[PDB]
Amino acid sequence: MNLYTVIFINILLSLTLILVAFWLPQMNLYSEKANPYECGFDPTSSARLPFSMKFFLVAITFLLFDLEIALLLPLPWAIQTIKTSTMMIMAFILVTILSLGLAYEWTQKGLEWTE
């Protein structure tokens, strides 16, 4: 209840700040005021156009690695087990497999950016 209360207090504080920031100062807006910024000239094309991504393979690898992190995260409770040999072997296997995948991608130039 207390955490929910303080989250709501933060929400109310930030909403109050942005509300007073939008309703306190004098408004004077026209077309050139609200045109988008392109260092003084008109934009040649819209910014909603496709914008090429040179680290897409690294992003997919980040998805897989983040799930490897999710697998590795119950370790502070796993170290309390009776059969610590099995836990230690399984954790070693998991981290070694993750490292081998990273090494294979590094060898196959997947970490390098395209073009």
Ligand X SMILES: CCCCCCCCCCCCCCCCCC(=O)OC[C@H](COP(=O)([O-])OCC[N+](C)(C)C)OC(=O)CCCCCCCCCCCCCCCCC
Site string for other proteins, 38-57 (x = CB under 8 A): --------x-xxxxxx--xx
Q: Which residue is nearest to ligand 3PE (CB)?
A: 106
Residue closer to ligand X (CB basis): 19 or 69: 19
Question: Using the rule CB under 6 A, is 107 a contact of ligand 3PE?
Answer: yes
Contact present, 43 and 36 (Cβ < 8 Å): yes
H-helix or E-strand spanning residue 84: helix 84-107
Question: Using the rule CB under 8 A, is 25 a contact of other proteins?
Answer: no
The conformational region for residue 40 under phi > 0 = left, psi -120 to 50 = alpha, else beta, is left
- Sites for ligand X among residues 2-41 (CB under 6 A): 24-26
Contact present, 53 and 59 (Cβ < 8 Å): yes
Contact present, 71 and 80 (Cβ < 8 Å): no
Interface residues with ligand 3PE (CB under 6 A)? 96, 99-100, 102-103, 106-107
